[PDB]
Design a protein. Structure first.
Length: 153
């Protein structure tokens, strides 16, 4: 369970993300697909992308990044009261997309890496700890839903 102070560290960095969600999404997805290339195999619309330059040039990838970060942002703004938002996401990621918890860990890593790089003003140690706790909560709750849905994750 996060504190309000922890939530405020999360939401204060998120506010900067929201200056340019699309740009942050490109950096985060490039980081994920570079660090864990296997994750790209899950995407029929993206698995062909060969290089960072191709990724940066993909209007579809840019749109996807906006989608992902906006969904995550809506979850974070619930400050842990995100049962409603997690239902459809868990169901789709468990049943249609088949996304293991390990891969959710990988994108969490990618998010933290990019925020640390772009936002040293709002992403010191305490803020990073807060964001790691928020993302751990997200993954813990998703994994519990996966189990309910019949997916081991």
């Amino acid at each position: 369970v996060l504190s309000e102070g922890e939530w405020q560290l999360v939401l204060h960095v998120w506010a900067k993300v929201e200056a340019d969600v699309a740009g942050h999404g490109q950096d985060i997805l490039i980081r994920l697909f570079k660090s864990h290339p296997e994750t790209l195999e899950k995407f029929d619309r993206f698995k062909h992308l060969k290089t960072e330059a191709e990724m940066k040039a993909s209007e579809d990838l840019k749109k996807a990044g906006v989608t992902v970060l906006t969904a995550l942002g809506a979850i974070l703004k619930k400050k842990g009261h995100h049962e409603a938002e997690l239902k459809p996401l868990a169901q789709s990621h468990a049943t249609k997309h088949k996304i293991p918890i390990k891969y959710l860990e990988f994108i969490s890593e990618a998010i933290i890496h990019v925020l640390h790089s772009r936002h040293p003003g709002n992403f010191g140690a305490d803020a990073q700890g807060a964001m790691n706790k928020a993302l751990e909560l997200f993954r813990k709750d998703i994994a519990a839903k996966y189990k309910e849905l019949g997916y081991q994750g």
